[PDB]
Design a protein around this ligand. Structure first.
Ligand SMILES: Cc1cc2nc3c(=O)[nH]c(=O)nc-3n(C[C@H](O)[C@H](O)[C@H](O)COP(=O)(O)OP(=O)(O)OC[C@H]3O[C@@H](n4cnc5c(N)ncnc54)[C@H](O)[C@@H]3O)c2cc1C
Ligand SMILES: Cc1cc2nc3c(=O)[nH]c(=O)nc-3n(C[C@H](O)[C@H](O)[C@H](O)COP(=O)(O)OP(=O)(O)OC[C@H]3O[C@@H](n4cnc5c(N)ncnc54)[C@H](O)[C@@H]3O)c2cc1C
Lengths: 394, 394
């Protein structure tokens, strides 16, 4: 019985684990799933509890409830290092050996060495982190009424006007009326500032969709500072660069959505990486390793049509897991593997709870239509991993 | 036509204002009520929103909803100083003249010059302050899951084991199960520590009631450190004295319930005070001033039967307001005044939402009985200032 070890129970890992579960009979292989939490969180929904527009329990599910304990041994622990030569994974509270390894440790924030950013800014990338953001913001607003001159309490800076940043400021905008009512705050004093180094909001997306997004969010009071890089971050705010001069934004809350990289454990373990990501072979294996598969945000795929990398998405992470599960089963059974080919469908960006933008079926979508479509797409993933029961739960 | 100016819309000021409203005609006197907020808060209930066991809106009511605009002119402003010589009150955004003055500015925290206490500990004395405490604590618990070795996040130190401290830790204890579930916290790691310099919890109360209180709160996991003074306070915690030696308690939350004094404006205005309060004459007037009345926590009353001071309570504050309103009406109309005579009824201390201790009528009360009695007593005040409508509201 060969030992398959899966590192990280995210989109890539959970799908891979459940795939192997469905494809393999009992005693065909040992399957160990490692995750630092006993729950799997819906990473694509994390902007909502971060803004307090949805309870965080709506964005996570117990791993034991998803898997078959007789087929998969779940281990709750934190991966520290991978020893490729010994084929051993080092954890905080033990060690594991493998015949096959699946790395799905996800992303970590990339702050590009910008001073104070790692230590004084917040990230939206886990249940813990979004509860921290949520309660941090509520704490600032609670402090304001006693110190009405401290409008920096009411200022939130979101660094990076990409997909995550745009969805987050949308949620923040919807949250503000209730939040201000809770803490006797003049809503006109609230500032939500989206700061982007690139010269365009949502750089790389269709201009028509972008302008609609900016118009809607702009209407809701969101400010955009574009072509404006953050130079440093403090607990008092950020310094930005405007017209070749430094300008300070006093803000008690700074959220970084300006870049991610593959989990550093991968690169530190000696794998050759580009921005922490591994340019895997056609079978999603790490080059030089016939027994190591890489999924999700740790994997790098190049679109051969335009020589551009696919972005780190949940959508492609899911497709990774399905392919790896299929190919691992084949390897266990001495069969031939099937080369991975991504099929990129449409993605919808939420603009608060009642508005959205995106491409679905090949057509531009807006408003309530787009908003419902996003919910349906997200529901499909829940059905994939937890069947109708998980869908009915929430 | 005399000008009556009332400073502070607390128990003393609101009752006095409503009393004058009920006793005087529309042309007998000008009545101005000054308050820094447009709302009157139920100070005796503030321990609940501080612990998050009751929404803060349940502990306040709009002042305009209580008074008759044709009889009383409400001014939303902050009192800065009182000029006795000119009979003028200075505000942050203007100034007022009076023929008669009623001072009901309440208490402010007394930290006795204990280092760091004023700057790093929290007080339960307004709607703003309890929302700050509430969100501070939730913020600490939110941070814990990401740093499970920082158990100091889960330690709450309450300085002073008097009436307020006991009620507050009672509320915190009831809150903990829900709070821990919200933030994935092991409840056994939580520490609620009541620190008291005196050698007994609730010093001055009946020992039987005290022992019952400690047993109930102790069962709920509340720790008591008695004969233990706080020496200094930091954002990291407190230093305490144990057997003449320094010991540190690491705690991200320190709440001070160990002493209050009369609002400093009274002393700063040149009034002769003892611990910030004025030892008023039998008609609740400031000595040397036949036209200045002091009510509530700014007033000091000595029980002439046993020469001991009455504690600063809402119960006696209410009686102050009624007496002053009656006596002011008499002065305006040239009648004779009535010496203040306190009638001290029973007071019940809550021990969470489902338990309590106190004296009612002439018998000691416990449990659900005591708990309901406290609610009814508090309800009586709501009826006094707002009739059945306000009662039905809450
Ligand atoms: C607000 C937000 C919105 C998004 N919306 C979309 C969208 O609409 N469409 C789309 O396609 N993509 C979206 N994404 C991106 C998508 O969420 C990620 O691409 C996806 O999470 C990547 O899958 P993953 O399994 O590789 O990583 P992850 O989902 O992050 O999974 C990593 C797992 O491994 C665990 N883990 C991490 N490190 C360790 C360690 N040392 N030891 C043990 N366990 C560890 C983690 O606890 C976690 O469970 C969004 C991302 C964010 C932040
Ligand atoms: C948790 C807690 C529980 C309590 N429980 C009880 C109990 O059960 N029974 C009992 O008898 N007592 C109880 N007390 C004590 C009681 O609350 C006080 O004695 C009461 O509040 C005093 O009434 P007051 O009007 O003098 O002061 P306050 O109630 O504090 O009123 C002061 C008013 O004046 C305003 N004000 C203050 N300064 C200014 C300024 N510069 N300018 C303008 N406005 C100003 C304030 O905003 C406020 O509206 C409790 C106290 C606390 C903290």
């Amino acid at each position: 019985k060969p030992s398959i070890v899966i590192l990280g129970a995210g989109y890539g890992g959970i799908v891979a684990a459940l795939g192997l579960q469905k494809r393999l009979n009992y005693n065909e292989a040992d399957i160990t799933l490692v995750n630092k939490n006993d729950y799997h969180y819906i990473t694509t929904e994390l902007h909502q509890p971060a803004a307090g527009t949805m309870h965080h329990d709506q964005a996570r599910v117990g791993i034991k409830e998803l898997i078959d304990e007789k087929k998969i041994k779940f281990v709750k622990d934190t991966v520290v290092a991978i020893d490729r030569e010994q084929q051993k994974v080092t954890l905080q509270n033990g060690e594991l050996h493998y015949d096959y390894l699946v790395v799905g440790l996800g992303s970590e924030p990339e702050t590009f060495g910008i001073e104070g950013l790692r230590e004084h800014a917040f990230s939206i990338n886990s249940i813990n982190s979004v509860r921290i953001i949520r309660q941090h913001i509520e704490y600032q607003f609670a402090k304001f009424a006693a110190e009405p001159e401290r409008t920096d309490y009411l200022t939130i800076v979101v660094g990076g006007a990409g997909f995550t940043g745009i969805e987050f400021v949308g949620e923040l905008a919807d949250r503000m009326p209730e939040l201000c009512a809770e803490y006797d705050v003049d809503p006109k004093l609230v500032r939500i500032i989206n700061v982007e180094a690139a010269p365009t909001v949502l750089p790389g997306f269709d201009p028509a969709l972008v302008n609609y997004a900016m118009d809607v969010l702009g209407g809701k009071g969101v400010e955009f500072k574009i072509g404006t890089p953050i130079k440093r971050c403090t607990p008092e705010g950020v310094v930005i660069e405007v017209d070749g001069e430094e300008e300070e934004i006093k803000a008690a809350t700074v959220v970084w959505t300006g870049g991610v990289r593959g989990n550093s454990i991968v690169e530190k373990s000696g794998f050759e990486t580009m921005r922490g990501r591994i340019k895997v072979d056609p079978y999603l294996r790490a080059p030089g390793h016939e027994n190591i598969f890489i999924v999700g945000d740790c994997a790098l795929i190049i679109n051969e049509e335009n020589n551009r990398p696919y972005p780190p998405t949940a959508q492609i992470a899911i497709q990774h897991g399905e392919n790896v599960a299929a190919n691992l089963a084949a390897l266990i059974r001495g069969g031939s593997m099937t080369p991975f080919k991504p099929h990129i469908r449409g993605t919808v960006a939420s603009l608060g709870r009642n508005d959205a933008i995106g491409i679905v079926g090949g057509r531009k979508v807006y408003g309530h239509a787009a908003s419902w479509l996003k919910k349906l797409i997200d529901m499909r993933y829940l059905y994939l991993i937890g069947g109708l029961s998980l869908v009915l739960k929430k």
